């Protein structure tokens, strides 16, 4: 119903966490009312590194939160 | 805790001194990496036979 307020994350690097460990750091290009996240230049971070193509789209069901890695 | 972004004045903020942070302890359930139902559920063909 309501569009989520991700307007402040328009051209900033974010870090999604997926389900307990899959930290996908990317640049938010777009979102929906379902928290599906479009990321440009994604990067998997493990506690090693893994690249995830040029663009990607990530399902909002597995998305828990997201850290704003870049300053606003 | 000292300086805020809040639009309320300092007299409201002294009334809005929040609770102390929560004392963390070790969790009890399995983490969400291990949260799943049961695997290796066998087929129902053995019930139709015997």
């Amino acid at each position: 119903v309501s569009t989520p307020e991700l307007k402040k994350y328009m051209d900033k690097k974010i870090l999604l966490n997926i389900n307990g460990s899959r930290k996908v750091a990317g640049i938010l290009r777009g979102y929906d009312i379902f928290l599906n996240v479009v990321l440009d230049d994604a990067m998997e971070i493990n506690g090693n590194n893994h690249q995830l193509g040029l663009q990607t789209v990530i399902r909002g069901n597995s998305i828990i939160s997201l850290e704003a890695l870049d300053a606003i | 805790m000292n300086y805020n972004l809040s639009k309320y004045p300092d007299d409201v903020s002294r009334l809005f001194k929040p609770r102390p942070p929560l004392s963390y302890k070790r969790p009890t359930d399995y983490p969400y990496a291990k949260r799943q139902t049961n695997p290796n559920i066998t087929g129902v063909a053995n019930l139709l036979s015997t």
């Binding site: 328009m10 997926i18 777009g30 929906d32 479009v38 040029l54 990607t56 789209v57 990530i58 399902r59 | -």
Partner: protein, 77 residues
Amino acid sequence: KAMVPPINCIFNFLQQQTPVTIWLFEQIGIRIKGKIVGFDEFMNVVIDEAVEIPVNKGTPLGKILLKGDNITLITSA
């Protein structure tokens, strides 16, 4: 640049026909590689030329209508 919504992102991803790596649920789930040919509003994605590889010897699978509730992540390989 501008905003790119996820439905138009998947639509451009459908038009370009890039090689696709589709992830799924955790350790029981198996990562699939293919090419997208159709989707809908519940994100039931139809893929072709599917080779499945488990989490760290792939087997061909054909054409697959993968349902929405198990889809986690989509990348362009």
